[PDB]
Amino acid sequence: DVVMTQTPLSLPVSLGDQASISCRSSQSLVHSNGNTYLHWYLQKPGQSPKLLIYKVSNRFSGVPDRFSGSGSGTDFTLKISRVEAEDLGVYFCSQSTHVPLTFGAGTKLELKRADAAPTVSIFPPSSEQLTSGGASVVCFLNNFYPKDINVKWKIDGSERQNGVLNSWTDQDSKDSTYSMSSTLTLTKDEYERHNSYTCEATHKTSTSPIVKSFNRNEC
């Protein structure tokens, strides 16, 4: 029942880099005999966890030898010597010393690549959508890097909202970019009640919100 803090959360690495995932406890993971149980797993998008190392530093049958664990008591470390493609996954540390058995939130090993600006498109609510009296204002924040991005909604000058759905792609397996969908859902009625609708995003690549818009009674 120990809180287990991983570091970092995202880790940009290049193929052949040396990655280092960190993991900490609130206690000490030392039993008496058997001794200090902490392990590492690798989950690949669409699979179960792969055991990599148990009890601080023992490889499992078949982990390539570029994976190492070290540490004692509080703070552990996973080194991954020449990061390859098949290493790219989520990394969890787990504590077997005390019941309940805890994990950390995981560290995503994601490909490294040059920053890139969001190509932001904006669509007003559809005709078929308004006969039904629903109003979806959606904007696609296509092909960016890195994933960290702040979107905001604005209705007539500036408001915020509540019917907001944000989906993100997995990293593009061709271009190493990410993408996002910001969707605002309003009643036909509230829609027909305001003119100016703005998705404005924030990225690393700018200190000026990427802004897009339409005015309703323009279409």
Binding site: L51, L101, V138, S181
Partner: protein, 219 residues
């Protein structure tokens, strides 16, 4: 090798019951120790429960979150593990994996494939497919981004195809997200202004679970 095989789960309503089961046709199931680990759609891994050896009075341990609703059991004689889930919550939606334990390796060595559990007081509801065209947030570019809104359907299982006369992919399917008790998903294609408007983009959306096939036209 010897994979834990899990079975059961599927759709079940909140408050429902369900019994999940691990087969591990593998050598010494009786002196081992067995656990269950879940992952809610997204998130990290969460330990459910473990049940000891014959040699420890089949002792038992549980996550707080499942204690008083879930009972883990096994029947050494057939070599099966059981997870008896009762008085379900939506937030019991997860992938359940039975983990092959080991004294001498250390906790969670072989994980099964998983068995998925969707706890929802819902039913079939066909996709509402809405076309997302450049209308009157201007006109601007050499390429132009279109989308399809696939709103409020259940269960998950959708399909976005795009009839484009080839002319560059640049397709992005953002993963479906629970808005309410139904799903919301989207898609963007990027075409050449060269040929669109003056041409076609079909957005074909399949839904096996309810035979639905809303295939929409953008113009």
């Amino acid at each position: 090798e010897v994979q834990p095989v899990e079975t059961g789960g599927g759709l079940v309503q909140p408050k429902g019951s369900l019994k999940l089961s691990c087969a591990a046709s593998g050598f010494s199931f009786n002196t081992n120790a067995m656990n269950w680990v879940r992952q809610a759609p997204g998130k990290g891994l969460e330990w459910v429960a473990r049940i000891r050896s014959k040699s420890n009075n089949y002792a038992t341990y549980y996550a707080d979150s499942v204690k008083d609703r879930f009972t883990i059991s096994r029947d050494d004689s057939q070599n099966m593990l059981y997870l008896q889930m009762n008085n379900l919550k939506t937030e019991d939606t997860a992938m359940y994996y039975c983990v092959r334990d080991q004294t001498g390796t250390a906790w969670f060595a072989y994980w099964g494939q998983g068995t998925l559990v969707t706890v929802s007081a819902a039913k079939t509801t066909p996709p509402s497919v809405y076309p997302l065209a450049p209308g009157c947030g201007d006109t601007t570019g050499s390429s132009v981004t279109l989308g399809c809104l696939v709103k409020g359907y259940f269960p998950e299982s959708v399909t976005v195809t795009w009839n484009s006369g080839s002319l560059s992919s640049s397709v992005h399917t953002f993963p479906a997200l629970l808005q309410s008790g139904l799903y919301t998903m989207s898609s963007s294609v990027t075409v050449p202004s060269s040929t669109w408007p003056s041409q076609t983009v079909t957005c074909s959306v399949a839904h096996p679970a309810s035979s639905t096939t809303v295939d929409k036209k953008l113009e």
